[PDB]
CSV table of C-alpha atoms and ligand atoms in Angstrom, one decimal:
chain,number,residue,atom,x,y,z
A,1,UNK,CA,155.1,96.3,42.6
A,2,UNK,CA,155.6,100.0,42.8
A,3,UNK,CA,152.1,101.9,42.4
A,4,UNK,CA,149.3,102.1,44.6
A,5,UNK,CA,145.9,102.4,42.5
A,6,UNK,CA,143.1,103.6,44.0
A,7,UNK,CA,139.8,102.9,41.8
A,8,UNK,CA,135.9,104.2,42.8
A,9,UNK,CA,135.0,105.6,46.1
A,10,UNK,CA,132.4,107.9,47.4
A,11,UNK,CA,131.9,111.6,47.6
A,12,UNK,CA,128.2,112.9,46.9
A,13,UNK,CA,127.8,110.5,44.5
A,14,UNK,CA,130.0,107.0,43.6
A,15,UNK,CA,133.0,107.8,41.7
A,16,UNK,CA,135.0,106.7,38.7
A,17,UNK,CA,138.3,108.0,39.7
A,18,UNK,CA,141.6,105.6,39.1
A,19,UNK,CA,144.6,107.2,40.4
A,20,UNK,CA,148.1,105.9,40.6
A,21,UNK,CA,150.0,107.1,43.8
A,22,UNK,CA,153.6,106.7,43.6
A,23,UNK,CA,155.4,106.5,46.9
A,24,UNK,CA,159.1,107.0,45.8
A,25,UNK,CA,158.3,110.5,44.0
A,26,UNK,CA,154.9,111.7,45.9
A,27,UNK,CA,152.6,112.1,42.7
A,28,UNK,CA,149.8,111.2,41.1
A,29,UNK,CA,148.5,110.2,38.0
A,30,UNK,CA,144.6,110.1,36.9
A,31,UNK,CA,144.3,107.0,34.5
A,32,UNK,CA,141.2,105.7,32.6
A,33,UNK,CA,137.8,106.3,34.2
A,34,UNK,CA,135.8,103.2,35.5
A,35,UNK,CA,133.5,102.0,32.9
A,36,UNK,CA,130.8,102.4,36.0
A,37,UNK,CA,131.1,104.9,39.0
A,38,UNK,CA,131.0,102.5,41.8
A,39,UNK,CA,131.7,103.0,45.9
A,40,UNK,CA,132.2,100.1,48.2
A,41,UNK,CA,134.2,98.2,45.9
A,42,UNK,CA,137.8,96.1,46.6
A,43,UNK,CA,140.6,96.1,44.6
A,44,UNK,CA,143.1,93.7,44.2
A,45,UNK,CA,146.2,92.8,41.6
A,46,UNK,CA,146.7,89.1,39.9
A,47,UNK,CA,149.0,88.8,37.2
A,48,UNK,CA,149.9,91.9,36.9
A,49,UNK,CA,146.3,92.9,36.0
A,50,UNK,CA,144.0,95.4,38.7
A,51,UNK,CA,140.7,94.5,39.4
A,52,UNK,CA,138.1,96.3,40.4
A,53,UNK,CA,135.3,93.9,42.4
A,54,UNK,CA,131.7,94.7,43.4
A,55,UNK,CA,130.7,98.3,45.1
A,56,UNK,CA,127.4,100.1,44.2
A,57,UNK,CA,126.5,102.7,41.9
A,58,UNK,CA,125.1,105.2,44.2
A,59,UNK,CA,123.9,108.1,41.8
A,60,UNK,CA,121.0,110.6,40.7
A,61,UNK,CA,119.3,108.3,38.6
A,62,UNK,CA,119.0,105.4,41.3
A,63,UNK,CA,121.1,103.0,43.0
A,64,UNK,CA,122.4,99.7,42.0
A,65,UNK,CA,124.9,97.1,43.8
A,66,UNK,CA,127.3,96.0,41.1
A,67,UNK,CA,127.7,92.4,40.5
A,68,UNK,CA,131.0,93.3,38.5
A,69,UNK,CA,134.1,92.1,37.4
A,70,UNK,CA,136.2,94.8,35.7
A,71,UNK,CA,140.0,94.5,34.9
A,72,UNK,CA,142.4,97.4,34.2
A,73,UNK,CA,146.1,96.7,32.2
A,74,UNK,CA,148.5,99.1,33.4
A,75,UNK,CA,150.2,98.7,29.5
A,76,UNK,CA,147.5,99.7,28.0
A,77,UNK,CA,145.3,102.1,30.2
A,78,UNK,CA,142.1,100.0,29.4
A,79,UNK,CA,139.3,98.4,31.7
A,80,UNK,CA,137.8,95.8,30.1
A,81,UNK,CA,134.6,93.9,31.8
A,82,UNK,CA,135.5,90.0,33.4
A,83,UNK,CA,132.9,87.6,34.0
A,84,UNK,CA,130.7,88.7,36.8
A,85,UNK,CA,129.9,87.2,40.6
A,86,UNK,CA,126.8,85.2,41.0
A,87,UNK,CA,125.1,88.0,42.9
A,88,UNK,CA,125.9,91.9,43.4
A,89,UNK,CA,128.3,92.5,46.2
A,90,UNK,CA,128.4,96.2,48.0
A,91,UNK,CA,130.8,96.7,50.6
A,92,UNK,CA,132.6,93.5,49.6
A,93,UNK,CA,136.1,92.2,51.0
A,94,UNK,CA,138.3,90.5,49.0
A,95,UNK,CA,141.5,88.3,49.0
A,96,UNK,CA,143.5,86.7,47.0
A,97,UNK,CA,145.3,83.0,46.8
A,98,UNK,CA,147.2,81.0,44.6
A,99,UNK,CA,146.6,83.4,41.6
A,100,UNK,CA,142.7,83.0,42.8
A,101,UNK,CA,139.7,85.9,43.6
A,102,UNK,CA,137.6,85.4,46.2
A,103,UNK,CA,135.3,87.7,46.7
A,104,UNK,CA,133.4,87.4,50.4
A,105,UNK,CA,130.5,89.2,51.4
A,106,UNK,CA,128.7,92.3,51.1
A,107,UNK,CA,125.4,93.3,50.8
A,108,UNK,CA,122.5,93.4,47.5
A,109,UNK,CA,119.8,95.5,48.9
A,110,UNK,CA,118.4,94.5,52.2
A,111,UNK,CA,120.4,90.8,51.7
A,112,UNK,CA,123.7,90.4,54.0
A,113,UNK,CA,125.3,87.8,51.9
A,114,UNK,CA,127.5,85.0,53.7
A,115,UNK,CA,128.6,83.7,50.7
A,116,UNK,CA,132.2,83.3,48.7
A,117,UNK,CA,133.2,82.7,45.4
A,118,UNK,CA,136.1,82.4,43.7
A,119,UNK,CA,137.4,83.7,40.6
A,120,UNK,CA,140.0,82.3,38.3
A,121,UNK,CA,141.3,84.4,36.0
A,122,UNK,CA,142.8,81.2,33.5
A,123,UNK,CA,138.9,80.6,33.2
A,124,UNK,CA,137.4,83.8,33.5
A,125,UNK,CA,134.7,82.4,35.9
A,126,UNK,CA,133.3,82.5,39.1
A,127,UNK,CA,132.6,79.4,41.4
A,128,UNK,CA,130.6,79.8,44.9
A,129,UNK,CA,132.7,78.0,47.8
A,130,UNK,CA,131.5,77.4,51.7
A,131,UNK,CA,129.6,80.5,53.0
A,132,UNK,CA,131.1,82.4,55.7
A,133,UNK,CA,129.6,80.7,59.5
A,134,UNK,CA,128.1,84.6,59.4
A,135,UNK,CA,126.7,87.6,56.9
A,136,UNK,CA,129.4,90.0,56.5
A,137,UNK,CA,129.0,93.9,54.6
A,138,UNK,CA,131.6,95.9,55.2
A,139,UNK,CA,134.3,93.4,55.7
A,140,UNK,CA,138.2,93.1,55.6
A,141,UNK,CA,139.8,90.5,54.2
A,142,UNK,CA,143.6,89.6,54.2
A,143,UNK,CA,145.5,86.8,53.2
A,144,UNK,CA,148.1,85.1,55.1
A,145,UNK,CA,149.8,81.6,54.5
A,146,UNK,CA,147.6,80.6,51.9
A,147,UNK,CA,145.1,81.1,54.2
A,148,UNK,CA,141.8,83.6,54.1
A,149,UNK,CA,140.7,85.7,56.7
A,150,UNK,CA,137.2,87.7,57.2
A,151,UNK,CA,136.9,90.3,60.1
A,152,UNK,CA,134.5,92.6,61.4
A,153,UNK,CA,131.8,93.9,59.3
A,154,UNK,CA,127.6,94.2,59.4
A,155,UNK,CA,125.7,91.4,59.5
A,156,UNK,CA,122.6,93.2,58.7
A,157,UNK,CA,121.7,93.8,63.0
A,158,UNK,CA,124.6,94.2,64.6
A,159,UNK,CA,128.0,95.4,63.7
A,160,UNK,CA,131.0,92.9,64.8
A,161,UNK,CA,134.2,92.6,66.5
A,162,UNK,CA,134.0,88.6,65.3
A,163,UNK,CA,136.1,87.1,62.7
A,164,UNK,CA,136.5,83.8,60.8
A,165,UNK,CA,139.6,82.0,58.5
A,166,UNK,CA,138.9,79.9,55.5
A,167,UNK,CA,141.0,76.8,55.1
A,168,UNK,CA,140.9,76.2,51.2
A,169,UNK,CA,141.7,72.5,51.2
A,170,UNK,CA,139.3,71.9,53.7
A,171,UNK,CA,136.4,73.8,52.1
A,172,UNK,CA,135.6,75.3,55.9
A,173,UNK,CA,135.4,78.7,57.7
A,174,UNK,CA,136.7,78.4,61.2
A,175,UNK,CA,135.8,81.4,64.0
A,176,UNK,CA,139.0,82.8,65.3
A,177,UNK,CA,139.5,84.6,68.2
A,178,UNK,CA,137.6,88.1,68.2
A,179,UNK,CA,139.1,91.8,68.0
A,180,UNK,CA,138.9,93.7,71.2
A,181,UNK,CA,137.2,96.3,68.9
A,182,UNK,CA,133.8,96.2,66.8
A,183,UNK,CA,134.9,97.0,63.4
A,184,UNK,CA,132.5,98.2,60.4
A,185,UNK,CA,134.0,99.0,57.2
A,186,UNK,CA,137.8,98.7,58.6
A,187,UNK,CA,140.8,98.6,56.6
A,188,UNK,CA,142.3,94.8,56.9
A,189,UNK,CA,146.0,93.9,55.6
A,190,UNK,CA,148.8,91.7,56.1
A,191,UNK,CA,152.4,92.8,57.2
A,192,UNK,CA,154.8,90.0,58.3
A,193,UNK,CA,152.7,87.4,60.3
A,194,UNK,CA,149.9,89.7,61.5
A,195,UNK,CA,146.3,90.8,60.5
A,196,UNK,CA,146.2,94.5,60.8
A,197,UNK,CA,142.5,95.7,61.3
A,198,UNK,CA,142.4,100.1,60.9
A,199,UNK,CA,139.6,102.1,61.4
A,200,UNK,CA,135.9,101.2,61.3
A,201,UNK,CA,132.9,101.9,62.9
A,202,UNK,CA,131.6,100.0,66.3
A,203,UNK,CA,128.4,101.6,66.2
A,204,UNK,CA,128.3,105.1,67.6
A,205,UNK,CA,131.9,106.4,66.1
A,206,UNK,CA,134.4,105.9,63.3
A,207,UNK,CA,137.6,104.4,65.0
A,208,UNK,CA,141.1,105.4,64.8
A,209,UNK,CA,142.5,102.7,66.8
A,210,UNK,CA,144.2,100.0,65.0
A,211,UNK,CA,145.0,96.4,66.2
A,212,UNK,CA,146.3,93.4,64.7
A,213,UNK,CA,146.2,89.4,65.4
A,214,UNK,CA,149.0,87.0,65.3
A,215,UNK,CA,148.5,83.8,63.9
A,216,UNK,CA,150.8,81.8,66.1
A,217,UNK,CA,149.5,83.4,69.1
A,218,UNK,CA,146.0,84.0,68.5
A,219,UNK,CA,145.8,87.1,70.2
A,220,UNK,CA,144.8,90.5,69.1
A,221,UNK,CA,147.1,93.9,70.3
A,222,UNK,CA,146.6,97.2,69.6
A,223,UNK,CA,149.4,99.4,68.3
A,224,UNK,CA,149.3,103.3,67.3
A,225,UNK,CA,146.2,104.8,66.5
A,226,UNK,CA,145.8,106.8,63.2
A,227,UNK,CA,146.1,110.1,63.2
A,228,UNK,CA,142.2,110.4,61.9
A,229,UNK,CA,139.7,108.2,62.8
A,230,UNK,CA,138.0,107.0,59.4
A,231,UNK,CA,135.2,104.2,58.5
A,232,UNK,CA,135.2,102.8,54.8
A,233,UNK,CA,139.1,103.6,54.0
A,234,UNK,CA,140.8,101.8,51.5
A,235,UNK,CA,144.2,99.9,52.8
A,236,UNK,CA,147.2,98.5,50.9
A,237,UNK,CA,151.2,97.3,51.8
A,238,UNK,CA,153.5,98.4,50.4
A,239,UNK,CA,157.5,97.4,51.0
A,240,UNK,CA,156.7,96.8,54.2
A,241,UNK,CA,154.6,99.8,55.3
A,242,UNK,CA,150.6,100.2,55.9
A,243,UNK,CA,149.1,102.7,53.6
A,244,UNK,CA,145.2,103.9,54.5
A,245,UNK,CA,143.6,106.0,51.6
A,246,UNK,CA,140.6,108.3,52.2
A,247,UNK,CA,137.2,107.4,54.4
A,248,UNK,CA,134.8,108.6,56.3
A,249,UNK,CA,135.3,110.4,59.9
A,250,UNK,CA,132.0,111.2,60.6
A,251,UNK,CA,132.5,114.9,59.6
A,252,UNK,CA,134.2,114.7,56.2
A,253,UNK,CA,135.3,112.4,53.2
A,254,UNK,CA,138.8,112.7,54.2
A,255,UNK,CA,142.0,113.0,51.0
A,256,UNK,CA,144.6,112.3,54.3
A,257,UNK,CA,146.9,109.1,53.3
A,258,UNK,CA,149.0,107.4,56.3
A,259,UNK,CA,151.5,105.7,56.5
A,260,UNK,CA,152.4,103.1,59.1
A,261,UNK,CA,156.0,101.8,59.8
A,262,UNK,CA,155.9,99.1,62.2
A,263,UNK,CA,159.4,99.5,63.3
A,264,UNK,CA,158.5,102.4,64.7
A,265,UNK,CA,155.0,101.7,65.8
A,266,UNK,CA,154.0,105.2,64.3
A,267,UNK,CA,151.6,106.8,61.8
A,268,UNK,CA,152.5,109.6,59.3
A,269,UNK,CA,150.8,111.5,56.6
A,270,UNK,CA,152.4,110.9,53.7
A,271,UNK,CA,150.0,112.7,51.2
A,272,UNK,CA,146.8,114.1,50.2
A,273,UNK,CA,144.4,112.0,47.6
A,274,UNK,CA,143.1,114.7,44.7
A,275,UNK,CA,140.1,115.1,46.5
A,276,UNK,CA,138.2,113.5,49.7
A,277,UNK,CA,136.2,110.4,49.4
A,278,UNK,CA,135.6,106.9,51.3
A,279,UNK,CA,134.5,103.2,50.2
A,280,UNK,CA,137.6,103.3,47.9
A,281,UNK,CA,139.2,99.9,46.2
A,282,UNK,CA,142.7,99.8,46.4
A,283,UNK,CA,145.8,97.4,44.8
A,284,UNK,CA,149.5,97.8,43.9
A,285,UNK,CA,150.7,96.4,40.8
A,286,UNK,CA,153.6,98.1,38.2
A,287,UNK,CA,153.7,101.6,36.5
A,288,UNK,CA,151.6,102.4,33.4
A,289,UNK,CA,152.6,102.6,30.1
B,1,VBT,O1,127.9,99.7,59.4
B,1,VBT,C1,128.3,100.4,58.9
B,1,VBT,O2,128.3,101.8,59.5
B,1,VBT,C2,129.5,100.5,58.2
B,1,VBT,C3,130.3,101.2,57.9
B,1,VBT,C4,131.0,101.6,56.7
B,1,VBT,F1,132.2,102.2,56.9
B,1,VBT,C5,130.9,100.0,55.8
B,1,VBT,CL1,132.3,100.4,54.5
B,1,VBT,N1,130.3,99.2,55.8
B,1,VBT,C6,129.2,99.5,56.8
B,1,VBT,CL2,128.0,98.7,56.9
């Protein structure tokens, strides 16, 4: 697309911000607020429409895990509710295959989901698919070659370095090589033929390390680390470069946005969000209006 959208997040409470960053000129635009505040959500784009999935409204008047699917139209700058998932999913992971949205894992209270469901925009309907072999919240999700990957997270007792892959035509999950680092709440995306896992929380400290999985070789290799440690970060890809937005570094809710150029293997600070926050949903699509 053209703009990097960030939706929701957490700072003192769950947020409703929707803001769009333009890597071409460095400008931020504040757009229509989410109907419901929510942190720990995921963002994605299908057919030029932005989607906000799952999360949790941490608020003074209580805390409510979200099963909501909400759709934003850049042309109209308006949100509309879509069909809700079968179960609330806080700290969700999302991926898109063949125009379908896969919702992966997440928590509902003290329940840690292994279940997975798929949304078909043409029918505005969710359907459960095979569950993961492992319960995962704070799970990273990415799509490569029409295969879905769930990486890391937290199963209710242990934080995970494990990862698994979903084969749609077989409706089957299979474990892949584990990461070299335990990561919960990492930013997971795809660039070229590799699944990147950036940052996260390994049980003791927030991470700045970044490793990538090559599907051909089935191995994980560390690349350059990020300038700032961070968990609960937003991540996306824009014109062959990785962007990581916000997160929590153990001391502050970051406004820092870093950019990874895989050819030079370097991270640089490219902008700051209008305010620090963690647990945002991120996606890339067209320019509003
Ligand atoms: O285990 C954790 O401490 C953890 C950290 C995170 F940043 C997110 Cl998003 N989720 C979880 Cl579950």
